[PDB]
Amino acid sequence: MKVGQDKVVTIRYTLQVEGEVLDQGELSYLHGHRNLIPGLEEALEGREEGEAFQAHVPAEKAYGPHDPEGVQVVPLSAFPEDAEVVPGAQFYAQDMEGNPMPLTVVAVEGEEVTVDFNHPLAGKDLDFQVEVVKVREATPEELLHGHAHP
Ligand SMILES: C=CC[C@@H]1/C=C(\C)C[C@H](C)C[C@H](OC)[C@H]2O[C@@](O)(C(=O)C(=O)N3CCCC[C@H]3C(=O)O[C@H](/C(C)=C/[C@@H]3CC[C@@H](O)[C@H](OC)C3)[C@H](C)[C@@H](O)CC1=O)[C@H](C)C[C@@H]2OC
Ligand SMILES: [Cl-]
Ligand SMILES: [Mg+2]
Ligand SMILES: [Mg+2]
Ligand SMILES: [Mg+2]
């Protein structure tokens, strides 16, 4: 069975960015419902069960470009009372509506912390080694819920 719309697809993958392995695992996902980054989904379309391949996904088809508006300066007093506020530290946060807006610390100067609200992989090209392990039809329950089930 080939990867396509409304198939549940099981893949084994390794993610590398700029020569460094960032993640590895196995995933089952519902194909064609914006559940995967667009570029990888495009690369998987039409693949047969058992196929293995490499996929270089440009930032634009992955987590998008780095938005300069995402880099902001916030007061140090906004951070958890006894947290370590240093470059690379991550904190969850939300916007003025309530949508998830996690951040990464870029730099600290006195009581001012420069943070980045961009996705950590924004602007990065992603390299995947991928194996298609299984392809099956989605169940009605999966189609109604919009994602794969165990
Ligand atoms: C609770 C339910 C949520 C569910 C949560 C998890 C299973 C927990 C687990 C830690 C998530 C991922 O672990 C599998 C982990 O995988 C990465 O490490 C990774 O290697 C990656 O990039 N992958 C995974 C392998 C397929 C390609 C890509 C992906 O497409 O992943 C998909 C993805 C993020 C798609 C977004 C969806 C929103 C779109 O807007 C965006 O479009 C840009 C693309 C994953 C599979 C989602 O469908 C499933 C979820 O997120 C990300 C670097 C970080 C990501 O952690 C956050
Ligand atoms: Cl899914
Ligand atoms: Mg069909
Ligand atoms: Mg097989
Ligand atoms: Mg100032």
Residue numbers in the entry: 1 to 150
What did the publication describing this PDB structure actually write?
In addition, we carried out co-crystallization with the FKBP inhibitor FK506. To the best of our knowledge, these represent the first structures of an FKBP domain in complex with long, unmodified peptides, and the first structures of a member of the SlyD family in complex with a macrolide inhibitor. Indeed, the only structure with a substrate-free IF domain is TtSlyDFL:FK506, which was crystallized in the absence of a peptide. FK506 binds in a similar way to all three copies of TtSlyD in the asymmetric unit of TtSlyDFL:FK506 and in both copies in TtSlyDΔIF:FK506, but exhibits some structural variation in parts of the molecule that are more distal to the binding pocket. The binding mode is similar to that observed in the FK506–FKBP12 complex. Specifically, the pipecolinyl ring, which mimics a proline side chain, is inserted into the center of the hydrophobic pocket, and four hydrogen bonds are formed: two to the backbone of N35 and I37 (V55 and I56 in FKBP12), and one each to the side chains of D23 and Y63 (D37 and Y82 in FKBP12). Apart from these conventional hydrogen bonds, a number of weaker CH–O hydrogen bonds are also present. Most noteworthy are three potential interactions between the C9 carbonyl oxygen of FK506 and CH groups of Y13, L15, and F128, which are reminiscent of three putative CH–O interactions observed between FK506 and FKBP12 residues Y26, F36, and F99. A comparison of the FK506 and peptide binding modes reveals that the interactions between FK506 and the backbone atoms of N35 and I37, which are mediated by the O2 carbonyl oxygen atom at C1 and the O10 hydroxyl group at C24, respectively, overlap with the two β-strand type interactions formed by K28S2 in the S2 and S2-W23A peptides. It furthermore shows that the pipecolinyl ring partially overlaps with the side chain of cis-P29S2 in both peptide binding modes, but is in a roughly orthogonal orientation relative to these, which enables it to reach considerably deeper into the pocket.
